Amino acid sequence: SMLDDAKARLRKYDIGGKYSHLPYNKYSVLLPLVAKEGKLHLLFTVRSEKLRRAPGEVCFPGGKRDPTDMDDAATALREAQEEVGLRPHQVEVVCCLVPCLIDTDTLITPFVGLIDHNFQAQPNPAEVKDVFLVPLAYFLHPQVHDQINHIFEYTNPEDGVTYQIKGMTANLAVLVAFIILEKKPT
Ligand SMILES: CCC(CC)C(=O)Nc1ccccc1O
């Protein structure tokens, strides 16, 4: 099937725990895959205008590891629960993609998760101003804008609202699209 095909592709790129013990400042992100209307979508957040770091920006759910987390995947699941109400029975963590090195002392680890069809987002307004879906196929032919720095613009045809997606978030989206959608009969 569509969902079984996605997980089997993703598993070939799983690095597992290989880099997880290194002595960095540690953050995790969850890349949430949702099936709607016969196609795969990614779920994004818009960060609250009140936050210290990157207020108003598009990002995946995520945050800083804390002492309660059993491992890096637990960080990503805790944060997703707090930000959008995703419960653990509603997500299957399929793999761990290549981590992102920043600022010389920080390592951000991305996990891909398959989301239950009955999940409905409950944005926590102290952390998240908006939640939206983008079809995975968009990231193969994006609408690009140069700020020189590449910025994707996505307009939701439901309401005509435009979102800007950039940086690590945009890079990870393209990576997941390539993994899952390259070389497929139509
Ligand atoms: C903006 C939220 C995101 C959560 C994973 C974050 O805090 N990133 C980050 C961490 C350390 C240095 C720079 C950064 O952008």
UniProtKB/Swiss-Prot annotation:
Start and end residues of each Nudix hydrolase domain: 24-149
Binding site for Mg(2+): 79, 83
Principal location class: other
Motif stretch (Nudix box): 64-85
Disulfide bonds: none
GO CC annotation, single: peroxisomal matrix
Site feature location: Important for coenzyme A binding: 53
Family: Belongs to the Nudix hydrolase family. PCD1 subfamily.
Assembly behavior: Monomer.
UniProt name for this protein: Peroxisomal coenzyme A diphosphatase NUDT7
The organism of origin for this protein: Homo sapiens
Lineage, highest ranks first: Eukaryota, Metazoa, Chordata, Craniata, Vertebrata
Protein encoded by which gene: NUDT7
Whole sequence portion shown: 14 to 209 of 238
